[PDB]
């Protein structure tokens, strides 16, 4: 096999800068048999570059490719918020047609405070015997956030699950959803439900709360 | 309109086989070739192998040689990838790719890709999802939907049949220790439109063949 | 015009050529007895263009050509003026103004093997269609893209020939068929191939 | 590589005559018969007649006898169909069709093979008193997925052709059939759906061609500001 | 002349089913019968000749049979791009004649339309006429109701509809409705809306704009 090493593992840059991604092969590979793909979240790979220097049809000029022998470079000049993706290099001139590990290109942004929302379980879900409480953290950067569930001023542990979206292609923010799951009985034993958000963009932790039945 | 279209998601018990289809349009299929690649959740692309349409000659990666069979059907311009001896490590999204070809001439790279086919291999059964509204409270408000207790991935969530897309966030699903999956899809809208505009979340689970339209109202 | 033309040599030959490397026998200075052809019932295809076979013993020509090869049964329809397909485009092309006969018979008992007969081949890839009566026997790697192949197989670099692998199949359309094409040439020159009546 | 390329769409007054051409390439012109087949809008197919490209002999269907003349020019490899005393029923798309050669079987019997393996693109002939008019092209400005388009209005006769970005854009394109307005002029619209993010980046221009009036219009459509 | 009666005039079937249409001749025409497929707006393309022979390049899913007076044409696995009108044609005796045709349609899952509305261009307003365009994209089934409302007043007699043929890929249709007024009448009103009723919509969907 031919080993494809991409460098670096992750790449954080502000919009407008120039990103330089390196792809190295364990032995020489023909230039007209190296390709660059761009993969966005929830999307198929897209042919960015072929032949190590040729742009596929409809690909913008800010994408460029170069290199030879055992070293190839994909350069994204004039970086844009929509360019957050994983970029892959593939050689297809010698079987097996190996891929690189990919390079994660992320966008730098001003610090943004999350917007915190709370949703009590619906009556339809209560009739089923299980209760789900959702705390939503909307449009914050950086990724690092802390969510604490409190039931009657009692800190919860081992019963909540978080989910973070990918970086937005427009404002480069993140969004978090935390789901607290209880039984009908356990949910109805208590009164006040609160989720506490600690984040860099907040001077003090922000608690959003609701009262069961009001 | 030049496209490659793959089959829908599949759930297969371990040890069985899955056959993914890849239909070509807009191209001289007879002069092209089709490569099959797989990507695990949050992982790298993995080359499986390729086929030459005209001759049917195949070449596979060493890992899939004894397990994969790639064929084509020229009467329908459709290529196929069959994976046998399914193990839990085969749960992934499988893509086909092909170069565009003008009769005799062909593009010098795989520029056409299919949408992908999500294949989950496990012993668990197929369970449809239950959809619950997260109603907005009483200058911008937030609402959404809760898609709970389904297996396996994926689920698709749209709002107002695709009319509403600004401010939407469909969070990646989390598998709740019971072995079923839960996901939430929210969207933010101005506070002056709750009592006037109507919002409906449309969830589809192809593996269970379940279509649901849930309206979200403010309490 | 002297002795008899050797048609039995062409028709009853033990082995036939691959269609991409089709054989041609040039027939000159002889008396041609076509009765052994049009009075036989063993042929599944017998079509003549520009001439009726029942008149061939009463006609004279400058030269006659007999091309022979093997193809699939469902491909025999391509041996005709104006046709398209892999055989007509890449292996054997008849001219639009063709004057001659196309004669084909099933040869499953001769050219099929249970394990497949891979001696018979056809051209699968070519940059352009063949001119009429053109023979191409090159084995150069076909260049599907703009990248030179440098004689090495790979992506967009394919071997241009493919074997029939004839087997005793169930559908007759898949079985091998032997084809003889008779071309009747008329130039501004004395006739050397004549029917027995002339 | 066989091509039959026919002359452009025309409008002719009733009682007049029309001559449709069919230029042949990629084969020996004189080796094949040439047939003519016409199709009235929304109706079936009607055989008109046959011409020998070599000697120019013709045979016409009875219902067109005395009204149609078929000719051939070997120098330009062109076949002509001329129809006179045009009526409203003669408004149709006219096609030249080519079958393979005939042959003799083992018994010496002449066998015909009149199945049409090649066709021209067709020629729309409109029989009307109305005068030719070039169209006006107006933008249909856009707003996920957005939609834009071009409205081609007040032209005669049919047809017009609409391409997008000089043929670069084909996906998501719908060119609707024309409608005959109450003013006797035709009107259609061609729309295409694109990604919203591309609204501010990619330029969209529709190219409209009304050949019967030699009208070529390029219209840039941009979101309203 | 020899008349060729085709049956049925039109039909619909889902992807994968087997379809068999028939052509009957008034007299004996031996086996000199051919089958053409005409996709919308293009010339007919020969698929079967002499009632059973598959034309070179035609997929094997097509077949035909018959000799004498009755003939049949069959598609084994119906495919999205098989959407066309099919004609039989004889050449046993001049003049050559065609059948009446058979319009084949494809069944698929119900898809709701996407509705867009387009105010008149300022350039067209200069000419003294206003055209409002309502677009329905990629829906099934064909039937839909488009209703124009001007200041909530239902309009009839001043709009025209045009429907595309079934798409060869996704088997859906598209529709455009144009509402035409004079500039004087156009400036007299404020709210312009088109209302769409379809099987794929639980409730009618309205898209509107204000002239301002
Ligand atoms: C080939 O041999 C058979 C049987 O011996 C004979 O009937 C036939 O005429 C021969 N063919 C020719 C062309 O002489």
PDB file of N, CA and C and ligand atoms in Angstrom, chain C residues 6-12 33 36-37 40 42-43, ligand 1:
ATOM      1  N   UNK C   6     -12.153 -21.268 -54.901  1.00  0.00           N
ATOM      2  CA  UNK C   6     -12.187 -22.162 -53.719  1.00  0.00           C
ATOM      3  C   UNK C   6     -13.072 -21.630 -52.593  1.00  0.00           C
ATOM      4  N   UNK C   7     -14.393 -21.697 -52.783  1.00  0.00           N
ATOM      5  CA  UNK C   7     -15.302 -21.228 -51.740  1.00  0.00           C
ATOM      6  C   UNK C   7     -15.378 -22.200 -50.576  1.00  0.00           C
ATOM      7  N   UNK C   8     -15.247 -23.496 -50.845  1.00  0.00           N
ATOM      8  CA  UNK C   8     -15.300 -24.467 -49.771  1.00  0.00           C
ATOM      9  C   UNK C   8     -14.170 -24.287 -48.780  1.00  0.00           C
ATOM     10  N   UNK C   9     -13.018 -23.802 -49.252  1.00  0.00           N
ATOM     11  CA  UNK C   9     -11.918 -23.470 -48.350  1.00  0.00           C
ATOM     12  C   UNK C   9     -12.360 -22.417 -47.331  1.00  0.00           C
ATOM     13  N   UNK C  10     -13.069 -21.384 -47.785  1.00  0.00           N
ATOM     14  CA  UNK C  10     -13.504 -20.338 -46.868  1.00  0.00           C
ATOM     15  C   UNK C  10     -14.591 -20.857 -45.929  1.00  0.00           C
ATOM     16  N   UNK C  11     -15.611 -21.517 -46.476  1.00  0.00           N
ATOM     17  CA  UNK C  11     -16.793 -21.852 -45.685  1.00  0.00           C
ATOM     18  C   UNK C  11     -16.556 -23.031 -44.753  1.00  0.00           C
ATOM     19  N   UNK C  12     -15.781 -24.019 -45.188  1.00  0.00           N
ATOM     20  CA  UNK C  12     -15.606 -25.236 -44.413  1.00  0.00           C
ATOM     21  C   UNK C  12     -14.250 -25.286 -43.714  1.00  0.00           C
ATOM     22  N   UNK C  33     -18.837 -21.029 -58.680  1.00  0.00           N
ATOM     23  CA  UNK C  33     -20.098 -21.762 -58.614  1.00  0.00           C
ATOM     24  C   UNK C  33     -20.766 -21.475 -57.272  1.00  0.00           C
ATOM     25  N   UNK C  36     -23.606 -23.954 -54.602  1.00  0.00           N
ATOM     26  CA  UNK C  36     -23.378 -24.644 -53.346  1.00  0.00           C
ATOM     27  C   UNK C  36     -23.750 -23.792 -52.143  1.00  0.00           C
ATOM     28  N   UNK C  37     -23.933 -22.484 -52.331  1.00  0.00           N
ATOM     29  CA  UNK C  37     -24.303 -21.586 -51.243  1.00  0.00           C
ATOM     30  C   UNK C  37     -25.809 -21.360 -51.158  1.00  0.00           C
ATOM     31  N   UNK C  40     -28.290 -24.312 -50.304  1.00  0.00           N
ATOM     32  CA  UNK C  40     -28.139 -24.954 -49.008  1.00  0.00           C
ATOM     33  C   UNK C  40     -29.138 -24.363 -48.021  1.00  0.00           C
ATOM     34  N   UNK C  42     -28.622 -24.763 -44.567  1.00  0.00           N
ATOM     35  CA  UNK C  42     -27.936 -24.728 -43.279  1.00  0.00           C
ATOM     36  C   UNK C  42     -27.720 -23.314 -42.745  1.00  0.00           C
ATOM     37  N   UNK C  43     -28.014 -22.282 -43.527  1.00  0.00           N
ATOM     38  CA  UNK C  43     -27.700 -20.912 -43.148  1.00  0.00           C
ATOM     39  C   UNK C  43     -28.884 -20.273 -42.442  1.00  0.00           C
TER      40      UNK C  43
HETATM   41  C1  LIG F   1     -19.019 -27.991 -46.683  1.00  0.00           C
HETATM   42  O1  LIG F   1     -19.170 -29.412 -46.446  1.00  0.00           O
HETATM   43  C2  LIG F   1     -20.528 -29.872 -46.527  1.00  0.00           C
HETATM   44  C3  LIG F   1     -20.530 -31.334 -46.136  1.00  0.00           C
HETATM   45  O2  LIG F   1     -19.326 -31.995 -46.503  1.00  0.00           O
HETATM   46  C4  LIG F   1     -21.071 -29.621 -47.932  1.00  0.00           C
HETATM   47  O3  LIG F   1     -22.427 -30.050 -48.010  1.00  0.00           O
HETATM   48  C5  LIG F   1     -20.963 -28.141 -48.278  1.00  0.00           C
HETATM   49  O4  LIG F   1     -21.374 -27.930 -49.624  1.00  0.00           O
HETATM   50  C6  LIG F   1     -19.526 -27.644 -48.091  1.00  0.00           C
HETATM   51  N1  LIG F   1     -19.445 -26.211 -48.335  1.00  0.00           N
HETATM   52  C7  LIG F   1     -18.983 -25.680 -49.475  1.00  0.00           C
HETATM   53  C8  LIG F   1     -18.973 -24.182 -49.545  1.00  0.00           C
HETATM   54  O5  LIG F   1     -18.593 -26.376 -50.407  1.00  0.00           O
END
